[PDB]
Enzyme design. Structure first.
Site, PDB file in Angstrom:
ATOM      1  N   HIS A  25      45.054  21.358  34.089  1.00  0.00           N
ATOM      2  CA  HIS A  25      45.493  20.970  35.633  1.00  0.00           C
ATOM      3  C   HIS A  25      44.865  19.312  35.799  1.00  0.00           C
ATOM      4  O   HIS A  25      43.376  19.917  35.590  1.00  0.00           O
ATOM      5  CB  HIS A  25      44.453  22.345  36.329  1.00  0.00           C
ATOM      6  CG  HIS A  25      45.625  23.908  35.662  1.00  0.00           C
ATOM      7  ND1 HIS A  25      46.129  24.152  34.871  1.00  0.00           N
ATOM      8  CD2 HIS A  25      46.502  23.922  36.954  1.00  0.00           C
ATOM      9  CE1 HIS A  25      46.904  25.088  35.307  1.00  0.00           C
ATOM     10  NE2 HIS A  25      47.398  24.730  36.184  1.00  0.00           N
ATOM     11  N   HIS A  65      41.664  27.940  36.356  1.00  0.00           N
ATOM     12  CA  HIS A  65      42.830  26.863  35.802  1.00  0.00           C
ATOM     13  C   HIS A  65      42.279  24.960  36.113  1.00  0.00           C
ATOM     14  O   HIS A  65      42.403  24.277  34.584  1.00  0.00           O
ATOM     15  CB  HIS A  65      43.736  26.803  36.698  1.00  0.00           C
ATOM     16  CG  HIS A  65      43.051  26.709  38.309  1.00  0.00           C
ATOM     17  ND1 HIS A  65      43.042  27.021  38.765  1.00  0.00           N
ATOM     18  CD2 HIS A  65      42.889  24.910  38.767  1.00  0.00           C
ATOM     19  CE1 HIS A  65      42.917  27.018  40.697  1.00  0.00           C
ATOM     20  NE2 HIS A  65      42.940  24.732  39.801  1.00  0.00           N
ATOM     21  N   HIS A 260      47.682  19.072  40.756  1.00  0.00           N
ATOM     22  CA  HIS A 260      47.485  20.226  40.221  1.00  0.00           C
ATOM     23  C   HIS A 260      47.879  20.628  38.995  1.00  0.00           C
ATOM     24  O   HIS A 260      46.542  21.127  38.722  1.00  0.00           O
ATOM     25  CB  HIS A 260      48.358  21.475  41.746  1.00  0.00           C
ATOM     26  CG  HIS A 260      48.104  22.625  40.950  1.00  0.00           C
ATOM     27  ND1 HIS A 260      46.298  23.518  41.406  1.00  0.00           N
ATOM     28  CD2 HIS A 260      48.300  23.791  40.255  1.00  0.00           C
ATOM     29  CE1 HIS A 260      46.627  25.205  40.698  1.00  0.00           C
ATOM     30  NE2 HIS A 260      47.599  24.706  40.007  1.00  0.00           N
ATOM     31  N   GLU A 410      36.810  48.428  45.301  1.00  0.00           N
ATOM     32  CA  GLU A 410      37.118  48.972  43.857  1.00  0.00           C
ATOM     33  C   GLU A 410      37.228  47.394  42.957  1.00  0.00           C
ATOM     34  O   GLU A 410      36.873  47.903  41.600  1.00  0.00           O
ATOM     35  CB  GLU A 410      38.800  49.944  43.766  1.00  0.00           C
ATOM     36  CG  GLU A 410      38.221  51.679  44.316  1.00  0.00           C
ATOM     37  CD  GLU A 410      38.542  51.183  45.935  1.00  0.00           C
ATOM     38  OE1 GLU A 410      39.257  49.861  46.445  1.00  0.00           O
ATOM     39  OE2 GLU A 410      37.936  51.473  47.294  1.00  0.00           O
ATOM     40  N   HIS A 472      47.090  60.276  45.903  1.00  0.00           N
ATOM     41  CA  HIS A 472      46.179  59.775  45.667  1.00  0.00           C
ATOM     42  C   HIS A 472      46.060  60.585  44.017  1.00  0.00           C
ATOM     43  O   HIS A 472      44.621  60.704  43.509  1.00  0.00           O
ATOM     44  CB  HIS A 472      44.725  61.154  46.769  1.00  0.00           C
ATOM     45  CG  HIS A 472      44.323  60.296  47.509  1.00  0.00           C
ATOM     46  ND1 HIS A 472      45.292  59.919  48.342  1.00  0.00           N
ATOM     47  CD2 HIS A 472      43.371  59.929  48.014  1.00  0.00           C
ATOM     48  CE1 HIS A 472      44.657  59.448  49.526  1.00  0.00           C
ATOM     49  NE2 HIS A 472      43.279  59.801  48.632  1.00  0.00           N
TER      50      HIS A 472
HETATM   51  C1  LIG Z   1      46.035  36.664  41.392  1.00  0.00           C
HETATM   52  O1  LIG Z   1      45.669  35.281  40.564  1.00  0.00           O
HETATM   53  C2  LIG Z   1      46.188  34.426  40.725  1.00  0.00           C
HETATM   54  N1  LIG Z   1      47.203  34.228  40.779  1.00  0.00           N
HETATM   55  C3  LIG Z   1      47.957  32.733  40.998  1.00  0.00           C
HETATM   56  C4  LIG Z   1      47.423  32.032  39.798  1.00  0.00           C
HETATM   57  C5  LIG Z   1      47.917  30.889  39.546  1.00  0.00           C
HETATM   58  N2  LIG Z   1      47.136  29.540  40.619  1.00  0.00           N
HETATM   59  C6  LIG Z   1      46.105  28.941  40.013  1.00  0.00           C
HETATM   60  S1  LIG Z   1      45.514  28.002  41.659  1.00  0.00           S
HETATM   61  C7  LIG Z   1      46.271  28.591  42.418  1.00  0.00           C
HETATM   62  C8  LIG Z   1      46.818  28.183  43.805  1.00  0.00           C
HETATM   63  C9  LIG Z   1      45.609  26.708  43.889  1.00  0.00           C
HETATM   64  O2  LIG Z   1      44.151  26.998  43.717  1.00  0.00           O
HETATM   65  P1  LIG Z   1      43.052  26.222  44.163  1.00  0.00           P
HETATM   66  O3  LIG Z   1      41.861  26.609  43.056  1.00  0.00           O
HETATM   67  O4  LIG Z   1      43.740  25.885  45.569  1.00  0.00           O
HETATM   68  O5  LIG Z   1      43.902  24.645  43.672  1.00  0.00           O
HETATM   69  P2  LIG Z   1      43.325  23.303  43.213  1.00  0.00           P
HETATM   70  O6  LIG Z   1      43.632  22.706  44.706  1.00  0.00           O
HETATM   71  O7  LIG Z   1      44.176  22.844  42.815  1.00  0.00           O
HETATM   72  O8  LIG Z   1      42.319  23.818  42.683  1.00  0.00           O
HETATM   73  C10 LIG Z   1      47.428  29.414  41.914  1.00  0.00           C
HETATM   74  C11 LIG Z   1      48.585  30.541  42.533  1.00  0.00           C
HETATM   75  C12 LIG Z   1      46.051  32.687  38.986  1.00  0.00           C
HETATM   76  N3  LIG Z   1      45.391  31.956  38.808  1.00  0.00           N
HETATM   77  N4  LIG Z   1      45.153  34.285  39.490  1.00  0.00           N
HETATM   78  C1  LIG Z   2      41.179  52.545  47.719  1.00  0.00           C
HETATM   79  O1  LIG Z   2      41.786  53.215  48.412  1.00  0.00           O
HETATM   80  C2  LIG Z   2      40.900  54.089  48.897  1.00  0.00           C
HETATM   81  N1  LIG Z   2      39.945  54.041  48.152  1.00  0.00           N
HETATM   82  C3  LIG Z   2      38.746  55.402  48.550  1.00  0.00           C
HETATM   83  C4  LIG Z   2      39.822  56.757  49.478  1.00  0.00           C
HETATM   84  C5  LIG Z   2      39.044  58.014  49.929  1.00  0.00           C
HETATM   85  N2  LIG Z   2      38.332  57.720  51.274  1.00  0.00           N
HETATM   86  C6  LIG Z   2      38.954  58.191  52.242  1.00  0.00           C
HETATM   87  S1  LIG Z   2      38.130  57.427  54.170  1.00  0.00           S
HETATM   88  C7  LIG Z   2      37.128  57.103  52.665  1.00  0.00           C
HETATM   89  C8  LIG Z   2      35.730  55.959  53.217  1.00  0.00           C
HETATM   90  C9  LIG Z   2      35.442  55.694  54.371  1.00  0.00           C
HETATM   91  O2  LIG Z   2      36.795  55.260  55.614  1.00  0.00           O
HETATM   92  P1  LIG Z   2      36.512  55.103  56.660  1.00  0.00           P
HETATM   93  O3  LIG Z   2      37.626  54.387  57.711  1.00  0.00           O
HETATM   94  O4  LIG Z   2      35.045  55.057  57.459  1.00  0.00           O
HETATM   95  O5  LIG Z   2      36.555  57.120  57.195  1.00  0.00           O
HETATM   96  P2  LIG Z   2      36.156  57.919  58.964  1.00  0.00           P
HETATM   97  O6  LIG Z   2      35.125  56.910  59.528  1.00  0.00           O
HETATM   98  O7  LIG Z   2      36.242  59.352  58.130  1.00  0.00           O
HETATM   99  O8  LIG Z   2      37.639  57.578  59.303  1.00  0.00           O
HETATM  100  C10 LIG Z   2      37.195  56.630  51.724  1.00  0.00           C
HETATM  101  C11 LIG Z   2      36.533  56.744  50.499  1.00  0.00           C
HETATM  102  C12 LIG Z   2      41.188  56.324  50.289  1.00  0.00           C
HETATM  103  N3  LIG Z   2      41.412  57.209  50.527  1.00  0.00           N
HETATM  104  N4  LIG Z   2      41.623  55.300  49.696  1.00  0.00           N
END
Ligand SMILES: COc1ncc(C[n+]2csc(CCOP(=O)(O)OP(=O)(O)O)c2C)c(N)n1
Ligand SMILES: COc1ncc(C[n+]2csc(CCOP(=O)(O)OP(=O)(O)O)c2C)c(N)n1
Ligand SMILES: [Ca+2]
Ligand SMILES: [Ca+2]
Lengths: 667, 664
Positions: A25, A65, A260, A410, A472
């Site tokens: 790259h 890259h 790229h 997460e 879940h």
């Molecule tokens: C989800 O994780 C992930 N998916 C795809 C790639 C491959 N890849 C490298 S770069 C780029 C898109 C363009 O990334 P960008 O920083 O704009 O590039 P340059 O401008 O050439 O530096 C993509 C699509 C990766 N490495 N990691």
């Molecule tokens: C990554 O996916 C994911 N992780 C954790 C949970 C459990 N969970 C339900 S709700 C909430 C955090 C608070 O969510 P929020 O919409 O503010 O709640 P309420 O105000 O009670 O409606 C969390 C932490 C989930 N369902 N899905």
């Protein structure tokens, strides 16, 4: 030489190394070279002769890259990365892999490439510096004081993980985090306006960042001023919006997607040399350019001054200095092993039928006073994952604390924790419901690839969680972790196995450890001294018969209690049975052949696995002539006790399946 | 009754149903009830008597833990969701599971709960409506015209997927997407300021959304005005910043994390009834309140009017109307099977050594004219994943197109595609490098759980990709897909298997299909007519011996050619060897036992699996008395040929492992 000529050394090495490899790259290294020259030559605090200096600034290439950018910088500034390694870019066993890898290469801080994770790691490094400074600095003695610099591109900006980690960095007011956005208008599909139209500056100001717009990324003076302005803002992380031309220097490919991710081509390289005024042949750098790039003398002076500071600190604060050294080395307290063994033995002698999530909290409470290096947290699930102990103090409340409220983030949490472990000084633990390992899944993989110590606390591990239902209830997640190279995964069956798994995890220096923990209460099993010691071997004989068993149950976690009940029923009917508890398949597999034979003898083919998880995994241990009492479907929303009955996790069903298996063996 | 009383019916049903279950989430339903009352009673276009009406508005509860909110709404407005189902919330086999599930409950549009995915699905539904309208509407005949409304909370806003999908929704100018943010200041850990401080309104303006700040989410007039404003903005999606009190009505638990995720308790419910002035017993709703909530009369009038519109469209545009009906039903063209089989047969008769990523592109090209329902894309990897065909038209250029530039948004892409499939009218395909299935992993799982048709085109499948190295080289990803319930996973060995796998994927009616495709060129295997037909059975005998085999190789994808070479060497020595090609373990496992026995006879235990992926998967087919030539480590950065040598994918090693196995 001019600053542009010095930056052009990066351009030349990068395009030439890509060309020789016929792979890689060139675009981003060529586009960012002027920014890199200013950052590295005028600001970065580092010593090429000691890449492990505790108080160095950290640099992260999130757009990994562009790996020849970092290899050029490390070579030019005097790290132990000879020109021969650049000639071996992307070749087997070189120190110059196609995406940078921590441990392969002097001065590389993290393994990057998967987009977005480098900026996450940088956020973790900046959290680590801020927290370590708050814990250790004293009046007149600021032994922790360093910046975290990150480069990132459009891909990192589009990825969701950038939202997670940059939002949190804003909340935590990480003034020593300074990110440079390579705003070049190009991604692999072409001109980014077809798919990426954010007002990125406004987005980052919404996170509470200091943003510098419209920097000419090919003008050293503009870049310098912007970095000075960012380093003077102490209460907000900074984003420098650097307008660059991808492939800068190439008449026909600059500003195009064609620059790229493929070699420019020999003809285009010749034209690029002519445009840049770069006369030197491939892999040639004159002594005068090395003299201007080299950082050994300045780096020595800076580290020597820091070592004097640290000596003065140690005279005034001897115990604190010893702790700093221990923690930066990743060493454990000398009495930890003995204290942890005492805790484990106490649990075995004092049964408690509690959830393994609670046994996990109890281990955190026991270890917490011994491990001031813990930097733990949960993704908005502290009261469910049970990650707080009495000594927890959230760093948003007191910067010298030991706990992070990660929010509902997460993936970002896990990749931040990778940055924390990579920084030194801390032992991170992270936590969510096990299902949501799937949100963080590649960051977990990256911890394993990078050989990092991190404990991953994953609770609510099965249909045993009950009414929240199939979105879940994990089924296949543990199997996915078990087949991940260098992962350790523990599914403890009681509070004793839980404490052993925690001890294993904190003592595991060369990779991460996932704990697979129940919502519901788990029976404690009886163990002799040998059996207690054998938990750490990953799989062990828990119940046995005299002579060769005609049936072996293999069970984990919450299902050991069920397997033992089935063993008792069959034993009372005269069947020769054995129960193997298998809290960690990876640890078991690492035991020698003689031990594994002693647990799972090759002569015994009537093997029954019992686990409330995907059945197909267990062919590894039961073979083709056994039985599996497992899940083969998604879960359902209902009370857990009704789910276990419906899905066959009952003594009657396990006994019936074992007797059916024996009947087939007999006839 | 007053609007507050009507909203309080939701509050009562929700707190009481949670209490009876001793499980669930009363806070968000109580906090959002006034917003829901305005949206559903004054704006939402729907027919409880036909939840499948093609032109209904779509509603999505992204904060799906608040499931009693949707169950209350569906019950009160007259869907087939009786009170006894609400009294069975969270109970085995009820129509009221703890998080809402599509197919379980009349009127539920998607399965939500995993945070952030509902808003992603809503973005996909809004993309589907916009694209379908552009494809089908004609002057004087606007048969597609509906809104997509989403509720979401702090959790969805914190999740990265919200950034991916809401950024893209801004680019695509989705003016009929209207989201309501439940801005209540509370998450599970407590007061959100400790971990969530964004100026969310400014963030969404940065995406190009229309944002309405400072709405009093407990004031019907404020909510109604905001919805009217949002509907009037046609060129940007809208975010309504609704300030609410979680657990509204509870004296002691409103505004507290305690109200999020546990029953309020009987005493607190009694105090809440007092505070709200709600006099009715649990599961009692008076007739006046049903009369104001019921949507059956108005909904049937609106759907009948639409039916009469569609009938007029069909008279003017008969072929287009037939296509609309076919596509909304998810049916395949009647001649697709025959035409696809003809294509597959041509490939077998005209061998080519090409990468299976290219064979995938060639199948898209062949199918494209036959499947106008395709709505495909790649996460910024079109020239590498090979997702464009000659007829691709990007929807950012032509709204009636068939292709989406998703950007670097793998998780968002996949969950958007779930929304596209849930909407009806389309067959989505998505694509990235296989490694980055890990970024999208829970959306892949959700497609399988929701029984949705989506083809997932995952290229660069092994160490065969070469120099990009171990962060990119899949090892254990395929094994994880293979053990996912209701997933189909195909790792074709040549261009013919690739076309069969594509056909299988588009013909699924009840779940997704992942294609595991190579960077590098794959040799074509010779096949009899029977073998050609048996590719679709997932595993088949490719090379054989006379009589019972002594040795069976099981291989997939790029490793079939290696297994064949080992077979040739051992056959020449006089071993009774066989090669099984196993492009799809799931399709093989679903075959009848006689077929399975014909391929992998139970008496033949000397089985050698060969695949450049994690070895541990293959115990399923080789058991304890076979051998596996697989990966057990991460990869390395080097040219692919050298990596295959370094990791044991050589004829010498495969033969040596087979001989070791035969020597016992
Ligand atoms: C989800 O994780 C992930 N998916 C795809 C790639 C491959 N890849 C490298 S770069 C780029 C898109 C363009 O990334 P960008 O920083 O704009 O590039 P340059 O401008 O050439 O530096 C993509 C699509 C990766 N490495 N990691
Ligand atoms: C990554 O996916 C994911 N992780 C954790 C949970 C459990 N969970 C339900 S709700 C909430 C955090 C608070 O969510 P929020 O919409 O503010 O709640 P309420 O105000 O009670 O409606 C969390 C932490 C989930 N369902 N899905
Ligand atoms: Ca770019
Ligand atoms: Ca909230």
């Amino acid at each position: 030489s001019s600053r542009k000529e010095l930056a052009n050394a990066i351009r030349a090495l990068s395009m030439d190394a890509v060309q020789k490899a016929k792979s890689g790259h060139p675009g981003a290294p060529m586009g960012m070279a002027d920014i890199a020259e200013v950052l590295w030559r005028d600001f970065l605090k580092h010593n090429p002769q000691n890449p492990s200096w505790a108080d160095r600034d950290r640099f992260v290439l999130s757009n990994g890259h562009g790996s020849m950018l970092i290899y050029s910088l490390l070579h030019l500034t005097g790290y132990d990365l000879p020109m021969e390694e650049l000639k071996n870019f992307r070749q087997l066993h070189s120190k110059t892999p196609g995406h940078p890898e921590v441990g392969y290469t002097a001065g590389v801080e993290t393994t990057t490439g998967p987009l977005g994770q480098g900026i996450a790691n940088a956020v973790g490094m900046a959290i680590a510096e801020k927290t370590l400074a708050a814990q250790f600095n004293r009046p007149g003695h600021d032994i922790v004081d360093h910046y975290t610099y990150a480069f990132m591109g459009d891909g990192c900006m589009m990825e969701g993980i950038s939202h997670e980690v940059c939002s949190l960095a804003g909340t935590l007011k990480l003034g020593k985090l300074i990110a440079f956005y390579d705003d070049n208008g190009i991604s692999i599909d072409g001109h980014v306006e077809g798919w990426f139209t954010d007002d990125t500056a406004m987005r980052f100001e919404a996170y509470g960042w200091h943003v510098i717009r419209d920097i000419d990324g090919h003008d050293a003076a503009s870049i310098k001023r912007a970095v000075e302005e960012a380093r003077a803002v102490t209460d907000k992380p900074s984003l420098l919006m650097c307008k660059t031309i991808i492939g800068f220097g190439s008449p026909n490919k600059a500003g195009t997607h064609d620059s790229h991710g493929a070699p420019l081509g020999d003809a285009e390289i010749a034209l690029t040399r002519e445009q840049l005024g770069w006369k030197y042949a491939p892999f040639e750098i004159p002594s005068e350019i090395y003299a201007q790039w080299d950082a050994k003398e300045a780096g020595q002076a800076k580290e020597s001054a820091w070592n004097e500071k640290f000596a003065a600190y140690a005279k005034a604060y001897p115990q604190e200095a010893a702790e700093f050294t221990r923690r930066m080395k990743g060493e454990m307290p000398s009495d930890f092993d003995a204290k942890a063994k005492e805790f484990i033995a106490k649990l075995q002698a004092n049964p408690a039928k509690i959830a393994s999530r609670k046994a996990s909290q109890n281990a955190i409470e026991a270890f917490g006073p011994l491990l001031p290096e813990f930097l733990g947290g949960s993704a908005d699930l502290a009261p469910s994952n049970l990650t707080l102990w009495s000594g927890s103090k959230a760093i948003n409340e007191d910067a010298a604390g030991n706990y992070i409220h990660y929010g509902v983030r997460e993936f970002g949490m896990t990749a931040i924790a990778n940055g924390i472990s990579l920084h030194g000084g801390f032992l991170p633990y992270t936590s969510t419901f096990l299902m949501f390992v799937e949100y963080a899944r590649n960051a977990v993989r990256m911890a394993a690839l990078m050989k990092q110590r991190q404990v991953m606390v994953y609770t609510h591990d099965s249909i045993g969680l009950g009414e929240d239902g199939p979105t879940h209830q994990p089924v296949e997640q543990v199997a996915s972790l078990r087949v991940t190279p260098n992962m350790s995964t523990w599914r403890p069956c009681d509070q004793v196995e839980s404490a052993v798994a925690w001890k294993y995890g904190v003592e595991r220096q060369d990779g991460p450890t996932a704990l697979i923990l129940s919502r519901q209460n788990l029976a404690q099993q009886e163990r002799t001294e040998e059996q207690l010691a054998n938990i750490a071997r990953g799989g062990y004989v828990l119940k046995d018969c005299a002579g060769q068993p005609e049936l072996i149950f293999i069970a984990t976690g919450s299902e050991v209690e069920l397997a033992v009940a089935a063993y008792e029923k069959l034993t009372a009917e005269g069947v020769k049975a054995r129960v193997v508890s298998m809290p960690s398949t990876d640890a078991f597999d690492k035991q020698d052949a003689a031990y594994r034979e002693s647990v799972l003898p090759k002569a015994v083919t009537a093997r029954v696995a019992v686990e409330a998880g995907i059945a197909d995994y267990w062919y590894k241990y039961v073979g083709l002539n056994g039985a599996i009492v497992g899940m083969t479907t998604f879960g359902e929303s209902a009370p857990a006790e009704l789910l276990f009955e419906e899905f066959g996790f009952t003594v009657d069903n396990v006994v019936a399946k074992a007797k059916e298996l024996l009947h087939h063996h007999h006839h």
